[PDB]
Design a protein around this ligand. Structure first.
Ligand code: K48
Ligand code: K48
Ligand code: CL
Ligand code: CL
Ligand code: CL
Ligand code: CL
Ligand code: MG
Ligand code: MG
Ligand code: MG
Ligand code: MG
Lengths: 13, 227, 227, 13
């Protein structure tokens, strides 16, 4: 039910 | 199975498997890339995380459906719940083994080390979701230890808007709420993380602002669920 | 792998795997059930078809994404397209082998025999989607032969609203349009099938009417795409 | 692009 992070945290380096 | 394939070819095939939504194939390619023994770039760490998160995500969803049916209730529901659980534990063990042999020990920069220690916490957390009794206590402490080490490095080495620092804090708060029976610690960490990020958004470019605010919105969505 | 499991336990696990969206596990359970050597009930034939259609569906979607990238374009896209294609061919070969050993020869009732011959046509059609040259000509004729045998039995033994007869006609029309380069035959078959079903709806109960009209709507959706 | 049949053609026997 809680949201965790996506696998990729940001678009770039 | 991947020892004969070039590292660059494994990375290219991982990207193709992602486009094809072939996440099991993507995870096998990225495991083969890690096993070449070189450190991973930012893009490669993202590919590894996407691949395994999608594989364990399907397992986690299947396990929840089977555990619900088993709780509602011959041996077949428990046997099949156990089969899925064992496969899920094997995926988590594989990821943890990659991190231990030898991604973490070779990761010196904060962005790599924090990302891998966050992943360690996350895969012990997925093990904790299906663990019982005293096994669960040791797995919970392994998750907690990895997240805490990552948190300590992230607060020393990264600004409060850094997406890796935010995503770590957001998953550590999930751990507290969902695994450790510590909803107050979960809420406090989400609130402090959100507020400290808010105060540093003024330093960011338009594109960096979008990266940081996307993770901040997940913190807020959890605080709305939890309060 | 399933030889030691009871038939009834394989069927129950297939239903659990369906609920968990574990279609590969569902197909392995149903293959094990077929290999017990007994005929399949209606519900069991549905489970077998759902399982394999979902497995080959993921493969078909991945193959289309990879073939598109390959057409737009080192050896890696072709090698990976070939890996997915080989796995897809292996799933189709497995289904065709179950039908040949020995589901079709033991199927005497029209509902079972037509369903299995339709499945034979469908899995040769999925092979034809990825076939080239002279291999493609023989695979196309194998699909066509299975569909035609099914059609001849369905028109003798089933009313024009029967869902199996409708679904057969709807897939044979797809074959004509997409595989055999016969769009006019596709349109004619869809139109005749639709109109003959329309004229027999008055014989049906509310629930049977819903079964038949759902397949009729697919015929109409194709005629809208094709004309 | 063309629609083919669902795997199950009707709810019952
Ligand atoms: N394939 C993906 N899902 C991602 C790749 C990258 C990336 C990171 C740095 C440089 C180039 C690409 C992501 N952030 S997610
Ligand atoms: N599990 C499924 N996806 C289905 C089961 C049946 C069924 C058929 C006859 C009797 C009972 C159930 C379908 N029509 S689809
Ligand atoms: Cl099982
Ligand atoms: Cl640790
Ligand atoms: Cl490959
Ligand atoms: Cl045939
Ligand atoms: Mg090399
Ligand atoms: Mg982001
Ligand atoms: Mg027995
Ligand atoms: Mg129907």
């Amino acid at each position: 039910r809680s949201h965790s992070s996506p696998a990729s945290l940001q678009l770039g380096t | 199975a991947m020892g004969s394939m070039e590292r660059a070819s494994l990375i290219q095939k991982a990207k193709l498997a992602e486009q094809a939504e072939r996440y099991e194939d993507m995870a096998a390619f990225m495991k083969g890339a890690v096993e070449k023994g070189e450190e991973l770039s930012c893009e490669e760490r993202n590919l590894l995380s996407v691949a395994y998160k999608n594989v364990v995500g399907g397992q986690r969803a299947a396990w929840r459906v089977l555990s619900s049916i088993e709780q509602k209730s011959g041996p077949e529901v428990r046997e099949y719940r156990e089969k899925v659980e064992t496969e899920l534990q094997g995926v988590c063990d594989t990821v943890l083994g990659l991190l231990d042999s030898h991604l973490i020990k070779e990761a010196g920069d904060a962005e790599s080390r924090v990302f891998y220690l966050k992943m360690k916490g996350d895969y012990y957390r997925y093990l904790a979701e299906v663990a019982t009794g005293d096994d669960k206590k040791r797995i919970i402490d392994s998750a907690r230890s990895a997240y805490q080490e990552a948190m300590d490095i992230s607060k020393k080495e990264m600004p409060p808007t850094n997406p890796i620092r935010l995503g770590l804090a957001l998953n550590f708060s999930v751990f507290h709420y969902e695994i450790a029976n510590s909803p107050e610690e979960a809420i406090s960490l989400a609130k402090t993380t959100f507020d400290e990020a808010m105060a540093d958004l003024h330093t960011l470019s338009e594109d960096s602002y979008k990266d940081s605010t996307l993770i901040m919105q997940l913190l807020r969505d959890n605080l709305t669920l939890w309060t």
